């Protein structure tokens, strides 16, 4: 039956996501 | 008249009081002063404590 394994649906968190634009403008 | 005169001259100072080139010279230095460009980026991260 190969219960769920549904590859843990979850998005970067909201500071994770500032953190990342952070080092891309940074990069920019 | 002398009335006429006096009215004139009334006028006179009245129009002196309001030339306002001044003002649009004042106007034109603050735009000069201002001289901005902008927009050539859009996404900014303005990233504030």
């Known amino acids: 039956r ?3 394994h549904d590859k843990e ?3 970067e968190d909201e ?3 500032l953190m990342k634009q952070q080092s891309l403008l940074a990069k920019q | 008249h002398v009335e006429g005169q006096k009215l004139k001259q009334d006028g ?3 129009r002196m009081k309001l030339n ?3 003002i649009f ?3 034109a230095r603050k735009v000069q002063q201002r001289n901005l460009g902008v927009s050539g ?3 900014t991260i303005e990233s504030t404590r």
Do not use: G, M, P
């Open chain 1, 2 to 4: 190969k219960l769920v």
């Open chain 1, 9 to 11: 649906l979850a998005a």
């Open chain 1, 15 to 17: 500071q994770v996501f």
């Open chain 2, 12 to 14: 006179d100072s009245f």
């Open chain 2, 20 to 22: 306002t080139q001044e």
């Open chain 2, 25 to 27: 010279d004042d106007w």
């Open chain 2, 41 to 43: 980026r859009i996404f």
